[PDB]
Amino acid sequence: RAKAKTRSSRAGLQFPVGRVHRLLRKGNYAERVGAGAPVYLAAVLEYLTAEILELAGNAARDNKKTRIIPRHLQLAVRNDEELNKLLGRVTIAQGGVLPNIQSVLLP
Amino acid sequence: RAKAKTRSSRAGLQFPVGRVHRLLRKGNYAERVGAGAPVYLAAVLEYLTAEILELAGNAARDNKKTRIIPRHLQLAVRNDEELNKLLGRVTIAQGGVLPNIQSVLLP
Amino acid sequence: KKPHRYRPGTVALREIRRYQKSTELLIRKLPFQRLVREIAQDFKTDLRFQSSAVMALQEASEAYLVALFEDTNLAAIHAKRVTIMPKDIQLARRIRGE
Amino acid sequence: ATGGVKKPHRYRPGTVALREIRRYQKSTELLIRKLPFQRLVREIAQDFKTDLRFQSSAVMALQEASEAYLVALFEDTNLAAIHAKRVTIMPKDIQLARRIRGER
Amino acid sequence: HYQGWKSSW
Amino acid sequence: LRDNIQGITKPAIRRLARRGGVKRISGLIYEETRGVLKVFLENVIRDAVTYTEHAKRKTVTAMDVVYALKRQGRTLYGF
Amino acid sequence: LRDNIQGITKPAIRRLARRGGVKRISGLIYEETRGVLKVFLENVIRDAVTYTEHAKRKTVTAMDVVYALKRQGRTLYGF
Amino acid sequence: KTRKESYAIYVYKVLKQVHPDTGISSKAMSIMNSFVNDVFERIAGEASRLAHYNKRSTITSREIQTAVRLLLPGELAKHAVSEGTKAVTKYT
Amino acid sequence: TRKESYAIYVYKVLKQVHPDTGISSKAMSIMNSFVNDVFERIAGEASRLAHYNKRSTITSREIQTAVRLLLPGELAKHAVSEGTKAVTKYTS
DNA sequence: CGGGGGACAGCGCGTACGTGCGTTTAAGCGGTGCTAGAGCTGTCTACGACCAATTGAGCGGCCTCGGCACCGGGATTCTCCAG
DNA sequence: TGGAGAATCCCGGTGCCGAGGCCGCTCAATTGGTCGTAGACAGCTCTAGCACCGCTTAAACGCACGTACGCGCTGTCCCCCGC
């Protein structure tokens, strides 16, 4: 009414809080949805997105590109064992796998 | 009011329609819950319970046992192909595994 | 005519090095869509499939086949072998629970 | 006596093993002793919240779940041994089963 | 006494 | 239309295995691969048909395929 | 308490294999079996610890144990 | 002390209906109770995500029918929904 | 009509963590589906955690437990640190 | 269709658990004692829901562009050489 | 051990198709009130978990000989690979 400042900017988060709160209320996941819970979820989503985008940018620097393609995202996810454990039963479209060569198959 | 009659007897069912409705409403699965959904869920649960207990009794009839023990339930679950497919990621306590021997192991 | 023909097994590694890092798809769109129509004909008829749904189905099937082929190759090199077999696929299916 | 100086019945390697398989896949009892399992449970909680209690029902549930997972892994290992034209199981078969299942 | 091996008792 | 399991091409199966790092391919691999692809495809298509028939729809959208893959624990991104 | 990883005895692993249908047992299977058992046990135990600090509880309940098992897709029935 | 929700008498009368001379032990009955609860949770979650997909705030018998066709494979679901069908045919 | 998406927010994250790179539209859809899937998993875990102990609300501890359950290890504890930093920034 | 090569069977070594026995030892039964927080319920109190008003950045759409993909040329490099 | 085949890499230039940036608007985002209500919170039981000990005996540790499967080396020719 006086000055509408976003609560995501109050916590220093780029990811929204009102959208997360509205989606939590719309799905009826609980009778009440707290105040710090969407902020925590937005911060965790921001950290995950920043880490995955940083790994994808590193892979794009390795293969000399500046635009992140689905192959770069797949390589970033499947490179470290942390995201491999997290995204174990998750597949990514428009992407392959690591170009690993077995020692026995090598001539 | 009038004479109290349960919805399970009106629908020809043994599983409680009202208890399933209570767990559906308090389980925050949806904002609004239909009248036929607890009846359908109770019918499905009753049919699955009757089929599993009948299979357990059939597996325990040749074992000279008149009581259902967890080994009988495990045998009934893993012997049926569709029950094995549905309960693929299901662990049954005190049940073990099926007593099958491979052909190469037998001399 | 051919002075060299490339000993067997190394062209396979050439296609491996080309296609593990590749991005374009391998299964052709038209026969996969036709197989989708044949499969859906056994189910409820007069059914349609949009381009995005067919693309998602093709990507999921190719990813599942790639994972199954990786498991099959791992089982083949596990058995002191190099060639993959249908029994290796059956073993992978039994281990994975599918 | 025993047909002269002789020796025990002396079953060949494998026969009493299938006897153990037959008698032991149907008695559905517990294969790991409870106090060593509870001691191992309390050991691997020392890098965790240290002052933590464990219920008897929770200990039994964990023991049963780990036992079922281990016998499923052993079934996978035996099928991988038969896959490799072998009878004995190797740790590389366990590694193969865990990698195919997605746990390695 | 079962010296060495169980035998036929 | 009635016989379309031959539409899955054998060198396409070869390319799929080359993406998987397979060096040597036997001749009996192709039929088993077609069979497992057929049963997986018919399971996912049956799930998508049920999903699109709950919504009183006659065309299957990509979101139906995504939710069908999420039901079996094989969630795919991008759609 | 400092060292009881040897508590899972070798004949216990032998009986585990006899339930699993194994005919012959090697000497190197025990260390890897104990290692993967330790990994799975510590994963489920850390999940149960997270569940028990969710509700300010110092003890681990079997209900939380089977919930943690259901979280990883290995749900246990009867607790 | 406090009352606890359980599926004891319902599973027991179903068992007596299908097997008049067969009982059940406590451990196996706890397994059956947990099985009923887990199938209830799975069907409720499937119907919830089905209703959230269609922007539907109401879960009817059609959502339960769709969830049973989805989660339960083969013909085992079909007879089940057929039972649900006659359940509705006995309710209406 | 309107379509809810996280595309522009992910763009701000990208320019705040990598000011010299871009991202394609298919990769944008992959990012949107990834964010939706992680949000779905964490929200479902938090709702289950609230349901188990007769809690009708979702607090910061619910998302704390969901993150320490679903997200593994080092990634999980950095997410925990980021969430606690955001909570402290809100409370300040 | 021509060439490669290795799966499977065979033969031979070998060795290491298999089975059993002598010896160890702690799992478990059972008991008693102590006690930490599950759990229970009354009480206080901020908090999310709800609603009315306001304002504000994402959405839709549009304009310009620049790196992705590709088409010509040229070389480094794997492979198999017969030497 | 210096040439071919095939194949990838590099490079300059160009088409162009989404990629990225900018303007109105609105509907979802933010702000300001109450208020039942669910959640902390603190004083009670007391349930079941933790700790120590006698005994024993069956599970388990270590040793003794053996054979049967694991493993090393060959041949066929049939199946698979390159074109």
Author numbering:
A (entry chain Q), B (entry chain U): 11 to 117
C (entry chain S): 36 to 133
D (entry chain O): 31 to 134
E (entry chain D): 80 to 88
F (entry chain T), G (entry chain P): 22 to 100
H (entry chain V): 28 to 119
I (entry chain R): 29 to 120
In the authors' words:
In Saccharomyces cerevisiae, cryptic transcription at the coding region is prevented by the activity of Sin3 histone deacetylase (HDAC) complex Rpd3S, which is carried by the transcribing RNA polymerase II (RNAPII) to deacetylate and stabilize chromatin. The five-subunit Rpd3S complex contains a unique subunit Rco1, three core subunits (Rpd3, Sin3, and Ume1) that are shared between the 12-subunit Rpd3L complex, and an Eaf3 subunit that is also a component of the NuA4 histone acetyltransferase (HAT). The overall structure of Rpd3S reveals that the Sin3, Rco1A, and Eaf3A subunits form a large continuous scaffold to hold the Rpd3 deacetylase in position.
In the alternative deacetylation state, Rpd3S is freed from being constrained by the Eaf3B-entry linker interaction and rotates by ~90° along the plane of the nucleosomal disc relative to the H3/H4 deacetylation states to bind to the top side of the NCP via multiple contacts. On nucleosomal DNA, the conserved Sin3 basic surface and the MRGA-PHDA arm bind to the phosphodiester backbone of the SHL + 5 and SHL + 1.5 of the NCP, respectively. At SHL – 7, the Eaf3B CHD is no longer visible, although the density of the H3K36MLA tail is still present. On Rpd3S, Rco1A AIM leaves HIM and becomes largely invisible, while the conserved R384 fits into an acidic pocket created by H2A (E61/E92) and H2B (E102) at the acidic patch, hence the naming of the AIM. The interaction between Rpd3S and the acidic patch is further confirmed by the finding that a Chd1 ChEx peptide, a known acidic-patch binding peptide, is able to compete Rpd3S away from the NCP. Therefore, it is likely that Rpd3S has a higher affinity towards the NCP at SHL + 2 and that this position is the first point of Rpd3S contact on the H3K36 trimethylated NCP. The repositioning at SHL + 5 is likely guided by Rco1A AIM’s interaction with the acidic patch and Eaf3A CHD interaction with H3K36MLA at SHL + 7.
